[PDB]
Each structure stands twice: as C-alpha cells, then as structure tokens.
Write a protein that binds this DNA or RNA. Structure first.
Length: 100
DNA sequence: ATTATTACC
C-alpha cells in the first residue's frame, strides 16, 4: 500500500506546514511536483498540490513528510491534469516536469 | 491521514 502519485491539500497552513512542503517538494524526492497557494478573501487559505514521487510512499509516511495536517488522495488525473489545475493558483511552486 | 467543503479524473 505504497504509491508514487498523490494529491494533497493543507488547509490553514502553518509555518511548519510550509517548511515541510519546502523541504520535501524537491527533485531529490519527486519526478514532478506542483504546489499552489491560495489565501484570498472568502475562503480557507490552502496549499494544494500534486506529487509524482521517485519512491513509493505509504500514506502515513507521506503525511509525516508533509507536516501532519494534509489531506491525501491517490492521484486520479495525469501529471499534466494536475499541472493545469494547480497552475491556476495565484502562486505556485513547480519542480521538474510532468510525466506522461 | 487529515483538514476541510478544499481536493486532480
């Protein structure tokens, strides 16, 4: 039950949430990663992203890697589907290139 | 696992 391709959301992200995302979402760990940040007026601020990991991870392990407050789900769309969705966010961090 | 109603297809 360990997988490479995941989506995640971190609602009301904390300092440590950002620190975990910044250290983990790197080319060392990911073939491709994209993480958007939205914190506008009438909604809960979030980090929201997609990870195509180099190594399989069990959900409990990825949860720890992302700071322990993340919602996780096995990715259902393609890397490019996720790139297009997350790149709509007003700020985003993009690591690597989508795999097809 | 986990905070939320946001979350790819």
């Amino acid at each position: 039950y360990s997988y490479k391709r995941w989506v995640f959301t971190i609602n009301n992200p904390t300092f440590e949430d950002y620190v975990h995302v910044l250290e983990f979402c790197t080319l060392d760990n990911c073939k491709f990663a994209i993480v958007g940040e939205e914190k506008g007026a009438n909604g809960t601020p979030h980090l929201q992203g997609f990870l195509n990991l180099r190594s399989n991870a069990r959900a409990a392990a990825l949860e720890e890697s992302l700071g322990g407050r993340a919602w996780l789900s096995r990715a259902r769309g393609s890397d490019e589907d996720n790139e297009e969705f997350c790149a709509k966010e007003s700020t985003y961090l993009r690591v690597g290139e989508p795999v097809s």
